[PDB]
Structures are given as C-alpha cells and as structure tokens.
Amino acid sequence: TSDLIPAPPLSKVPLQQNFQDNQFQGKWYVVGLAGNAILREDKDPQKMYATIYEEKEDASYNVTSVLFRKKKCDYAIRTFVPGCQPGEFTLGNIKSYPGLTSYLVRVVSTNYNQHAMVFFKKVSQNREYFKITLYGRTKELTSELKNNFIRFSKSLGLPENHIVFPVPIDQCID
Amino acid sequence: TSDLIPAPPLSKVPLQQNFQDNQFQGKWYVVGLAGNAILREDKDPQKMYATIYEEKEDASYNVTSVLFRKKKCDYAIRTFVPGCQPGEFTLGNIKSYPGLTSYLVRVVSTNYNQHAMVFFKKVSQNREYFKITLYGRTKELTSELKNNFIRFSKSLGLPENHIVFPVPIDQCID
Ligand SMILES: *[C@@H]1O[C@H](CO)[C@@H](O[C@@H]2O[C@H](CO)[C@@H](O[C@@H]3O[C@H](CO)[C@@H](O)[C@H](O)[C@@H]3O)[C@H](O)[C@H]2NC(C)=O)[C@H](O)[C@H]1NC(C)=O
Ligand SMILES: *[C@@H]1O[C@H](CO)[C@@H](O[C@@H]2O[C@H](CO)[C@@H](O[C@@H]3O[C@H](CO)[C@@H](O)[C@H](O)[C@@H]3O)[C@H](O)[C@H]2NC(C)=O)[C@H](O)[C@H]1NC(C)=O
Ligand SMILES: CCCCCCCCCC(=O)O
Ligand SMILES: CCCCCCCCCC(=O)O
C-alpha cells in the first residue's frame, strides 16, 4: 500500500548466547531474506548476494556486501560498532547519513560454521523498516532451515510474500 | 444518526497568546481526541498516534502523522500554511483535494514542553466536521488535564461519547 508492517518489539527478537567475535567473521551468503520492505518480485526475482564481516582492531566490524544489481557488482561498506550486548551493533558514523535516526543489528542465532540469522532495524525519515537475513557459509539451503526461517519471520508478523530466498547466482559474489 | 453536531462559532475557540513557531514544533502524541465525527468504539478502542510538526523554511509546517491502522503503520503528510493570526493555519495545496472547501487549524492552548490543545475544522462535500486533539510531549495523561479537556469539548457541544482517549500503544509511533 503506502503503509508498513510494524517492527516487532525487541523482546520478540532473541540474541545469540556467548556470541563469539572472531568466529562469526568471514564471508556469509544470504540464502534467506525477509522484512516489512522486502517483497517477492516475480518479474525480477531477488538474486543471492554475500556480506563480509571483517573484525577490526577495536572489535568493530568492517561489513562489506557484494550484490549483483543491474548488470554490475555493487559494494556496500559500513562498520558495525558493538552495542550493549555481545551480538548487538549500531551503525558507525551515523551522522554521514543525515536522514537516519537509529540503526540496530541483533544476531538472533548462529553456529558460525554453517548458518546464522541476523535481525536489522532502522528508523529513517520517520519510517521503521526491519529485516532478517538467513546467512549460510555456503549457498546451500536445507528444507529444515528454510522452514525454521519462515517461522521466525512470521513470529515477527511477516506475511509469506515478504519472505524471499535469493536465487543462487555465483558471480560478483564468489 | 445521519446527522452531525454543529461546529461551534469561532468566537468560542480561543487562540494561544504569542504562539511561538519553533517552540511548538517536534513530535506530539495524541493523548486526548474529540469531535462531532469521533466516537467511542468499544469493539475497536482508538489507539494512540503521533503527529510531527516540522517547521519549514517559509514558516509553514510539514505535518506528519504516524498511525497504527489495521496491522500497519499509516503515514499522513500535509502542510499547514499560516493564517491571519499566529497559531492559525490552513491546508496547503487545497486543490489536491477537489472535495474540500475549507480547512482551518487553531492552536487553542499550549506550554510547548508538555501539552497542547488544537482545534480543527473543515467543510467537505457540504459536511462541517470539527475536532480537538489533546497533545502531550509524552504519552502521560494527568487527571487534571484530562478533565480540563473534557470541559473544553463539552463547552463546544461535544457529548461524552464523542470524547476519546487513545490507548497508549508504543509501536509504529515511537
Ligand atoms: C573494509 O573492507 C573493504 C573490502 O571488503 C575495504 O575496501 C577495499 O579497500 C582497498 C584499499 O583501499 C581497495 O583496493 C584498492 O583499490 C584501488 C582502486 O579502487 C586500487 O588502485 C588499489 O591499488 C587497491 O587495489 C579495494 O578495492 C576496496 N574494496 C572494496 C570492495 O571497496 C575497506 O578498505 C575495508 N575497510 C578498512 C578500514 O579496512
Ligand atoms: C515531511 O516529513 C516527511 C517525514 O516525516 C518527509 O517524508 C520522508 O521523505 C523521505 C525522502 O523523500 C523518505 O525517505 C526516503 O524513502 C525512500 C523509500 O520510500 C528511500 O528509498 C530513500 O532512500 C529515503 O529513505 C521518507 O520515507 C519519508 N517519510 C515518510 C513518513 O513519508 C517529507 O519529505 C517531508 N517534507 C518535506 C518538504 O521535507
Ligand atoms: C542505512 C543502510 C543500511 C542497510 C540496511 C540493511 C542491510 C543489512 C545487511 C545485510 O543484508 O547483510
Ligand atoms: C483533509 C484531511 C485532514 C485531516 C483532518 C484532521 C487531522 C488533524 C491532525 C491530528 O489529529 O493531529
């Protein structure tokens, strides 16, 4: 419409236990993706993309994403500074984005050598978008994972058409 | 019925003194609400919503409201152009609403750091609706305020069942 599905209350978003810095780092493929602003576009199905978590010196993350947007490889670099709890981050520099008023990152779950589920929320110019990414160390998607993902999203108020699974492409991202 | 309670004569609607531009701006929560077209719906109690007064360059107001209508966050943006007296505004663009013939806004009272009471009137397709909003800088509602609000409405010919107090929700509006 012109409307947006409410971001769930934080209490509904789990936080990994004993989140480990250096074990979560490295390349992560986005095999699952969902959010109030994410939608299924059959005309242009969403393509898989990778995101790299580089552990800096002061424990921050130099996060680089490699997407395949319209004929070319796009690169999004941004740093995630630690939050109040291991596994929580805020967007560094924030001022560099005069339109942003808040941006949180919450690692809901992970095993570090296979998959992960990360929650993102950010209010901008008075709009409250949020999303969940299903990370895979490989491009593989297990039916169990997929389902357990769809469940979390729904538990967050996300209808089916707001839950997408990027087509593995294998280019610009390998 | 099919009828509507008359809008009071303007003489019955006070206007704040020395209304201050930049001091009234910012986020306002709607803790009190009343009007000839507003009614108590126990089946669906009215939820609290916010309205933002953004002071533009040419002193106009970029007014944005964030409501929680049926599962989603709704956003209503409109500009309030100054009227004949500090604290009075008319709806900009008006033509963009071929059905509207008049729309006035009158800040009846405010302290800028706590509360405010604003009057709205607009004739549309020959119907004369009007309403009063009780603004709070926070979601708090003091018994004194509440009562002093109910009094103003009644003084305007508004029965009790036309005086509503939105349920604080704290979502889509924070
Ligand atoms: C965070 O990670 C990204 C990469 O994931 C780092 O960006 C990379 O920065 C290097 C050095 O600035 C870039 O390489 C240089 O590229 C230029 C041409 O653009 C070339 O002339 C140089 O010889 C060199 O190859 C690299 O292209 C760039 N990669 C991306 C994807 O932008 C970034 O520096 C990291 N941040 C920190 C603080 O380490
Ligand atoms: C009056 O205030 C409202 C906000 O209270 C302003 O609307 C906001 O406008 C910005 C920029 O046009 C929107 O942000 C952009 O959203 C798109 C997606 O819709 C995104 O692709 C852009 O990168 C950027 O984030 C913002 O969503 C929108 N907010 C709302 C609630 O509609 C409006 O522009 C203000 N009027 C003036 C004259 O400043
Ligand atoms: C203000 C810009 C931030 C982009 C918002 C979310 C991106 C999350 C990264 C990812 O999908 O792995
Ligand atoms: C023609 C549409 C105008 C809507 C009428 C009244 C809205 C007042 C704003 C508020 O409640 O804070």
UniProtKB/Swiss-Prot annotation, chains A, B:
What induces the gene encoding this protein? Expression is activated by the oncoprotein BCR-ABL; BCR-ABL misregulates expression via the JAK/STAT pathway and binding of STAT5A to the promoter. Induced by insulin.
A single BP term in Gene Ontology: negative regulation of hippocampal neuron apoptotic process
The annotated subunit structure for this chain is: Monomer. Homodimer; disulfide-linked. Heterodimer; disulfide-linked with MMP9.
Q: Which family does it belong to?
A: Belongs to the calycin superfamily. Lipocalin family.
Primary location: secreted
Q: Where does enterobactin bind?
A: Y103, K131
Q: Which organism is it from?
A: Homo sapiens
What's the protein name?
Answer: Neutrophil gelatinase-associated lipocalin
Q: Which UniProt keywords apply?
A: Apoptosis, Cytoplasmic vesicle, Disulfide bond, Glycoprotein, Immunity, Innate immunity, Ion transport, Iron, Iron transport, Pyrrolidone carboxylic acid, Secreted, Signal, Transport
* Functional summary from the UniProt entry: Iron-trafficking protein involved in multiple processes such as apoptosis, innate immunity and renal development. Binds iron through association with 2,3-dihydroxybenzoic acid (2,3-DHBA), a siderophore that shares structural similarities with bacterial enterobactin, and delivers or removes iron from the cell, depending on the context. Iron-bound form (holo-24p3) is internalized following binding to the SLC22A17 (24p3R) receptor, leading to release of iron and subsequent increase of intracellular iron concentration.
Binding, a carboxymycobactin:
Y49, A50, T51, K122, K131, Y135
* Taxonomy of the source species: Eukaryota, Metazoa, Chordata, Craniata, Vertebrata
